[PDB]
Design an enzyme around this catalytic site. Sequence first.
Site: not given
Ligand SMILES: Cc1oc(-c2ccccc2)nc1CCn1cccc(C(=O)Nc2cncnc2)c1=O
Ligand SMILES: [Mg+2]
Ligand SMILES: [Zn+2]
Length: 313
Positions: A269, A72, A217, A68
Amino acid sequence: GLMQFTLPVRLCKEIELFHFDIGPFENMWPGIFVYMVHRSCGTSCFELEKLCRFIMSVKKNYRRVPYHNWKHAVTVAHCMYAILQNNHTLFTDLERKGLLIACLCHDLDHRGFSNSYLQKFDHPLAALYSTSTMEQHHFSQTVSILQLEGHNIFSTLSSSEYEQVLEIIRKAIIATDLALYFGNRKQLEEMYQTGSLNLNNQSHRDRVIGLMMTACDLCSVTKLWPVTKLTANDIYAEFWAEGDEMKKLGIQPIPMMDRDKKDEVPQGQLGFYNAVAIPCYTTLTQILPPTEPLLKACRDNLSQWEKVIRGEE
Ligand SMILES: Cc1oc(-c2ccccc2)nc1CCn1cccc(C(=O)Nc2cncnc2)c1=O
Ligand SMILES: [Mg+2]
Ligand SMILES: [Zn+2]
């Protein structure tokens, strides 16, 4: 007046493409932004002296956090730039002005922590703003920087045009609260299918601008795989820092933020692409057909995460 910004040939060409990466040379990001304002808005939209002073005050009020940060800000402004350029006739003079500024300012003074963490920490900002805590802070900082002597890039607008543009920026920045995205897209989905979507209805534009803001975003999921993969490290570095801070408050963080569960990232992901990114760029392509390359790039990266899971990288 007759002073343009011009970029090297590869950037001049690549900057028009959604998947453009602004590169590692911090010192070129301001020129990249002005270049985009000039081609998107006009050489006449902002007094160059005032714009350049605004840009550097905004840069200064972004912090040295892994994701952030200032890069970005400019990445999200570039995605908005590509959407506006591929949709020339759909947007007012005021919207084009406001939205590139909204994007540059959308995460001003971010500390690398979610609204959840502020609330559980009991941060002063959580008492001052009960919902969209960081996002109301970002708008607040934007209005602050706009009110520094020499920094009013909107000085040539009328009293009522000035109010419309600050109101576009406010809605635009509030919309980056991902908690508001889900319902915003469900409504846009229903309105498009039942055929009631009307871009002359101001409450309908507001919703569409909000989805554009979610799309810009999240645009790091719409880059070429090597950019997406390396940005994912920056994003998890904040999440795991926040997880550490949750543990310090005596709270087991969600797995997303728990660095002991790095192994589950590929599956997280997948969830994220299926639950958020893909639906976002789908609905956006339906409303704005020329934004399809964002949906295509997103699907390509989902496919790359599936390959990580299958042990093919
Ligand atoms: C719900 C959940 O649980 C896990 C999880 C669970 C167990 C073990 C490890 C990870 N990851 C998520 C979602 C993660 N997440 C949430 C919000 C935003 C982003 C994001 O903007 N990603 C992004 C990637 N590459 C480039 N730009 C942006 C994001 O990746
Ligand atoms: Mg924000
Ligand atoms: Zn942002």
